[PDB]
Amino acid sequence: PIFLNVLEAIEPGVVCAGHDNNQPDSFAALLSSLNELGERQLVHVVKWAKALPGFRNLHVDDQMAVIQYSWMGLMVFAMGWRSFTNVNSRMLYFAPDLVFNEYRMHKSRMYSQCVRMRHLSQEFGWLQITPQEFLCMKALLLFSIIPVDGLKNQKFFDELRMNYIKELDRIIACKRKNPTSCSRRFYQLTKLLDSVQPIARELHQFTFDLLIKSHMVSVDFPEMMAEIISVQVPKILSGKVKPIYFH
Ligand SMILES: C[C@](O)(COc1ccc(C#N)cc1)C(=O)Nc1ccc(C#N)c(I)c1
Numbered sequence: 001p002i003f004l005n006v007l008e009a010i011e012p013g014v015v016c017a018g019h020d021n022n023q024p025d026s027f028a029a030l031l032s033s034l035n036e037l038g039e040r041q042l043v044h045v046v047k048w049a050k051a052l053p054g055f056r057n058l059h060v061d062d063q064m065a066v067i068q069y070s071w072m073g074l075m076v077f078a079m080g081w082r083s084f085t086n087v088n089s090r091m092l093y094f095a096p097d098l099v100f101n102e103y104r105m106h107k108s109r110m111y112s113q114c115v116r117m118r119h120l121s122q123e124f125g126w127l128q129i130t131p132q133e134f135l136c137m138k139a140l141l142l143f144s145i146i147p148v149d150g151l152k153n154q155k156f157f158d159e160l161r162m163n164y165i166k167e168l169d170r171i172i173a174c175k176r177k178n179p180t181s182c183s184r185r186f187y188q189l190t191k192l193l194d195s196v197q198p199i200a201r202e203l204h205q206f207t208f209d210l211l212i213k214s215h216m217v218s219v220d221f222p223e224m225m226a227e228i229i230s231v232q233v234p235k236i237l238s239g240k241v242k243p244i245y246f247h
Contacts, residue, residue, distance in 0.1 A: 003053060003167050003170075004132055004135065004136075004171070006051075006052075007052075007132075007135040007136065007139060008135065010048050010051045010052065011048070011135060012041075012044040012045075012047075012048050014095075014096060015037070015040050015041050015044060016037075016040075016095050016096055016098075017033040017034070017036060017037035017040070017094065017095040017097050017098035018033065018036055018037075018040075019033035019037075019095075019097050021097060025103065025104055025107050026107070027107055027108065027109060027217065028217065028218045028219060030104065030107060030108045031108065031210070031219045032219060032220045033098055034094070034098070034108070035219070035220065035221055035222055035225055036222065037094060037095055038071075038075065038222075038225060039222045039224060039225055041075055042071060042224070042225075045071060045074055045075075046067055049063070049066075049067050049142060050063070052139055052142070054160050054163060055160070057156050057159075057160060058151075058153060058157060058160065059151065059152035059153040059156070061151075061152050062151040062152050062153055062157060065147070065151065065232075066142065066143065066145070066146075066151075066157075067142070068228050068232045069145040069146075069236065069241055070141060070142045070143075070144065070145055071228070072200040072203050072204055072207075073141055073144070073145070073196050073197065073199075073200040073243075074138065074141055074142060076117060076120070076196055076199050076200055076203065077120075077137070077138055077141055078138060079092060079093060079094055079117060079121075080117055080120040080121040080123070080124060081124050081129070081134050083117070083118065083121035084121045084122070084124040084125050087099070088125070089118055089121035089122045089124075089125065092105065092114055092117055092118060092121070100114060109206075110206055112202065113199060113202045113203050113206065116198075116199045116202070117199060120192075120195060120196070120199065123192055123195070127188055127189075127192060129189075129192070132171055133168070133171055133172070133189060136164070136167055136171050137168065137189060137192070137193055139164055140161070140165065140168060140193065141193060143157065143160060143161040143164055144161075144193070144197075144243055144244045145197075145236075145241060145242065145243040145244065146241065146242070147235070147240060147241050147242075148239075148240060148241070148242060149240070161244075168189065169182070169186070172185045172186055190246035190247065191246075191247065193246065194245045194246055194247055197243040197245065200243075201236075201237075204233050204236055204237060205237060207229055207233065208229060208233050208234070208237060211226060211229045211230065
């Protein structure tokens with residue numbers, strides 16, 4: 001289980017937001033914690049991505065671009081699984097110190113996005129996603145969004161993405177002698193992966209608008225995040241960078 005040992009080995013641990021839960025909920029505070037949390041998780045997404053099998057093959061510039069484009073989606077996917085395993089989808093488990101109930105979802109002004117993630121959370125349970133399918137799907141998620149004008153080394157990217165899809169096939173086939181059974185499972189999983197993109201898009205859109213009016217809502221955007229929202233996020237929203245759907 002070489003490939004799976006590695007994913008299990010590099011999976012990031014618990015990341016906290018540093019939120020003040022003794023303080024009454026407020027839009028400004030909730031968003032500042034989401035921003036800080038986002039930034040803390042990105043530190044780990046980079047380290048995780050760099051230790052992924054084959055990731056170093058990519059051109060240095062494609063490595064940073066791919067990580068930044070996939071950032072939101074990766075957090076969404078990982079948060080849904082935590083929400084499912086920790087609180088059986090009753091609340092969104094952004095972090096141990098940042099759990100959203102409907103009241104928080106509503107005050108964050110990202111209710112529709114939150115409800116969609118809760119649904120994703122429920123999907124992990126309904127589809128009985130195993131920890132291993134989760135780890136592979138998550139890694140594959142990192143290789144699911146590219147520029148129309150291509151990466152510096154598109155070919156190396158295509159090879160890598162193909163190899164990860166082949167790993168998922170193996171995880172699905174393992175203990176499934178029935179081809180039909182493997183096909184239906186692959187269908188279910190690629191469908192779940194595709195559902196992540198639309199959610200990341202709404203969060204992207206929301207975050208973009210929020211930054212532009214940041215000075216009007218007292219929200220504190222971290223340096224790195226502000227730069228990525230203004231430089232990378234617009235390419236996605238304008239259609240220059242697109243996610244790779246299966247369906
Ligand atoms: C509102 C915002 O702070 C915006 O953060 C980002 C993150 C990535 C990009 C990009 N590219 C833009 C904003 C946010 O959605 N944060 C956030 C933090 C943690 C999780 C988890 N788990 C999630 I889903 C979202």
